[PDB]
Amino acid sequence: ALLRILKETEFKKIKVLGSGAFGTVYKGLWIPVKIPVAIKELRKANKEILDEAYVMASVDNPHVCRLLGICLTSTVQLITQLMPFGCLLDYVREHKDNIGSQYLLNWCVQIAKGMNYLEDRRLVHRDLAARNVLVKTPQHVKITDFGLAKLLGAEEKVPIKWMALESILHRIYTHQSDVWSYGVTVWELMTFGSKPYDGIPASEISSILEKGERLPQPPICTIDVYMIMVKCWMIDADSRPKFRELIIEFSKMARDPQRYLVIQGDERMNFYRALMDVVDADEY
Ligand SMILES: Nc1ncnc(Nc2ccc3c(cnn3Cc3cccc(F)c3)c2)c1CNN1CCCCC1
Numbered sequence: 001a002l003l004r005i006l007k008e009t010e011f012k013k014i015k016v017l018g019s020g021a022f023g024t025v026y027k028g029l030w031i032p033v034k035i036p037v038a039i040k041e042l043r044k045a046n047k048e049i050l051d052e053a054y055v056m057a058s059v060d061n062p063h064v065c066r067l068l069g070i071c072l073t074s075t076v077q078l079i080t081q082l083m084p085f086g087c088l089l090d091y092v093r094e095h096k097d098n099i100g101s102q103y104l105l106n107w108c109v110q111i112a113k114g115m116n117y118l119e120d121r122r123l124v125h126r127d128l129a130a131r132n133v134l135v136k137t138p139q140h141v142k143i144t145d146f147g148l149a150k151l152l153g154a155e156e157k158v159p160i161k162w163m164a165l166e167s168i169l170h171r172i173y174t175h176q177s178d179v180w181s182y183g184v185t186v187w188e189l190m191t192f193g194s195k196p197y198d199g200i201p202a203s204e205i206s207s208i209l210e211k212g213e214r215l216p217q218p219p220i221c222t223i224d225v226y227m228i229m230v231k232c233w234m235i236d237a238d239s240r241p242k243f244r245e246l247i248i249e250f251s252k253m254a255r256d257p258q259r260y261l262v263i264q265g266d267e268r269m270n271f272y273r274a275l276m277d278v279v280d281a282d283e284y
Helices: 046-057 088-094 101-120 165-170 175-190 202-210 223-232 243-255 272-276
Strands: 011-019 023-030 035-042 067-072 076-081 133-137 140-143
Touching: 011 035, 046 067, 046 076, 088 133, 088 175, 101 140, 101 175, 101 243, 165 175, 165 202, 175 223, 175 243, 223 243
Parallel strands: none
Antiparallel strands: 011 023, 023 035, 035 076, 067 076, 133 140
């Protein structure tokens, strides 16, 4: 079965990872052999959920997290493979001094590949952000949490600072609005985890965007890279780069990293063991 319906006794929530926007995520073990997993519990009609869930379990790309199972008790619990290194936002914030140009550019490539794959599956993420990119290994990141937004009425009567103008104003979500969010995610990485429009009230975001104001150029960014970001935030959705084009361009830059990102001491660059702690779901 592509989407395994797990019994409430097959898995167990041990520790709390964090409070998401759609529910609380726990760290746990899935005993079909104990498989380390992340379990998200959301805040019958479960057929729509099971249908939307199926899509989440049928994705097969190395840069996209896949849902492994679901438990429909009093609440809905989503089970997926645990990514021991946590989310990319916290990762860059914590290694702000040992992250080189090579790693940053490759993460941009990987995220673009994962998004292009979702685009091929006609799946709009609706909530791409560095917090929703997980680290399998420092050299391997993956996108997660796609689809949840829609499953909970995102485009029905909110991460405003990551949303495309048209999404804010008209609840219009497309692969091109995801490109906008990709632009912001890239900005979060290049600034080592800064908060976008920090201080600025969410209620005023649409206003400044219409005025042509945009997030500032990250210090390590050459104008070559910043331009890509700005293009992702053009009002005309169809004018924004396509994920296919972003893969090609960041891949180009990944071949000569120090030419596009200026990081002092680049050439020379807690630990999730005692943090997270059995066969890896990947091996299983
Ligand atoms: N370290 C991790 N390893 C694995 N998943 C994680 N989160 C996570 C994200 C989305 C999730 C689940 C379970 N269902 N869905 C929905 C879904 C949708 C699409 C594909 C798909 F596969 C899943 C779990 C974390 C994050 N832990 N962070 C650490 C920092 C504080 C906040 C919590």
